[PDB]
């Protein structure tokens, strides 16, 4: 059960590179590739993410992809950047120009052939591949434009394998471009159709967690990236380590996806506390449940209080008993039953892994398929229609071979997804 990962774009490249940093840290992998872990369990299932070489070096099973060449150099300059395989570093002469059209049709296509070549080369080495993981941002040009085409062709070639993607959804009040709605609208329907499960990252929520949950003065992209990497590694905790109640990617997808359209999830991690209150807080699984279900602790910037829960998934890590890993879920269920869908009794899937994350005695990751994900796309569609009404910033996309009909169909697809979430929000037994 080997997951093979890919990181697209600048945001995707950094997020994946430090994700590999975290995976190496928890598996006891020296940035130089050697193994220094003190536990046999780290090497027991290291083949899920790492491949051993002739000299014993553990190379990540990752594909680093972006049209800009400078991001490869930056990632290699990263402290663990020497770990990745050099031939996996695939890049274009010219960047996407932050254009979905350039990243998806003209420049991305001429290099997606090599992307698929290296992806298949890494996939064939696995005896029984579990799936493809992708990390990218939908506001960028090459992370979204070419990443969605990658997801589409991997869906075409490997239908049964689990397709997980981490989409960093852009947003207005932290926006740093003018074509986030264009790229996001052009990417959402590919994410809907060609991905088993697409989980969202929002910069306001990561930054808010940094300000108030972590109480650190100057959050960086590194800090938000660490926050997302925590749950990124925690989602495969049962895959990589034993536990009382094991699980895997397809089991989570089955327990979280009632209908194929509904596969957009929130994010969640606990515990998260400031350095000054690390020893004052009494770490317990009940407190973990409380923080995990707290709205602010979500690292997606959409309030769960405004919607209803299709399903939730709680991947707990650390030595624990079953009392407050099931009774706590029951308690939150029957105490916030107004926030949970009636026709899906006990919306919460609970899984337990014995190995806790390094530096923490106990932890938990949250995957929530709430109906409030439609608030992701309300504002995105409003901004997209605002730009599209006067046909602005569209000549860039149309000069690369894209038609206005595709933009209209993207509007229709986002509206369909929003209505699909709304109907199950207000659906009654």
């Amino acid at each position: 059960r080997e997951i093979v990962s890919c990181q697209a774009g600048q945001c995707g490249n950094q997020i994946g590179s430090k994700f590999w940093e975290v995976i190496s840290d928890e598996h006891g992998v020296d940035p130089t590739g050697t193994y220094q872990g003190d536990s046999d369990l780290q090497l027991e299932r290291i083949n899920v993410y790492f491949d051993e070489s002739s000299g014993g070096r553990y190379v990540p099973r990752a594909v680093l992809m972006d049209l800009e060449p400078g991001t490869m150099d930056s990632v290699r300059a990263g402290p663990y950047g020497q770990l990745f395989r050099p031939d996996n570093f695939i890049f274009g002469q010219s960047g996407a120009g932050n254009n979905w059209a350039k990243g998806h049709y003209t420049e991305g296509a001429e290099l997606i052939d090599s992307v698929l070549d290296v992806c298949r080369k890494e996939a064939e080495s696995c005896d029984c591949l579990q799936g493809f993981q992708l990390s990218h941002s939908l506001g960028g040009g090459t992370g979204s434009g070419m990443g969605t085409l990658l997801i589409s062709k991997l869906r075409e070639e490997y239908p049964d394998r689990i397709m997980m993607t981490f989409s960093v959804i852009p947003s207005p009040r932290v926006s740093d471009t003018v074509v986030e709605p264009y790229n996001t609208t052009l990417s959402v329907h590919q994410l809907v159709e060609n991905s088993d499960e697409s989980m969202c990252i929002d910069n306001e929520a990561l930054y808010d967690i940094c300000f108030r949950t972590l109480k650190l003065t100057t959050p960086t992209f590194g800090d938000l990236n660490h926050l997302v990497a925590a749950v990124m590694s925690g989602v495969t905790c049962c895959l990589r380590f034993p536990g009382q109640l094991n699980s895997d990617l397809r089991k989570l997808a089955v327990n979280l996806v009632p209908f194929p359209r509904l596969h957009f999830f929130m994010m969640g991690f606990a515990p998260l506390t400031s350095r000054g209150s690390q020893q004052y807080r009494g770490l317990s699984v009940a407190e973990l449940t409380q923080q995990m279900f707290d709205a602010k602790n979500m690292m997606q910037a959409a309030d769960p209080r405004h919607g209803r829960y299709l399903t939730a998934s709680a991947l707990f890590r650390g030595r624990m008993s079953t009392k407050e890993v099931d009774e706590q879920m029951l308690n939150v269920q029957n105490k916030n039953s107004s926030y949970f869908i009636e026709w899906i009794p006990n919306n919460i899937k609970s899984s337990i892994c014995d190995i806790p994350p390094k530096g923490l005695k106990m932890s938990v990751t949250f995957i929530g398929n709430n109906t409030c994900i439609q608030e992701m796309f309300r504002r995105v569609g409003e901004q997209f229609t605002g730009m599209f009404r006067r046909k602005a910033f569209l000549h860039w996309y149309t000069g690369e071979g894209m038609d206005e009909m595709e933009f209209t169909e993207a509007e229709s697809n986002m509206n369909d997804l929003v209505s699909e979430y709304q109907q199950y929000q207000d659906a009654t037994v």
Binding site: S39, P242, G243, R319
Partner: peptide
């Protein structure tokens, strides 16, 4: 930092050999 599994911690080689032979005598 203890990485022992729950199977290991609860499932241990259990010895029934007498610790105190004075009571046996």
């Amino acid at each position: 930092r203890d990485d022992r599994t729950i199977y290991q911690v609860d499932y241990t080689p259990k010895d029934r050999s007498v610790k105190n032979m004075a009571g046996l005598a």
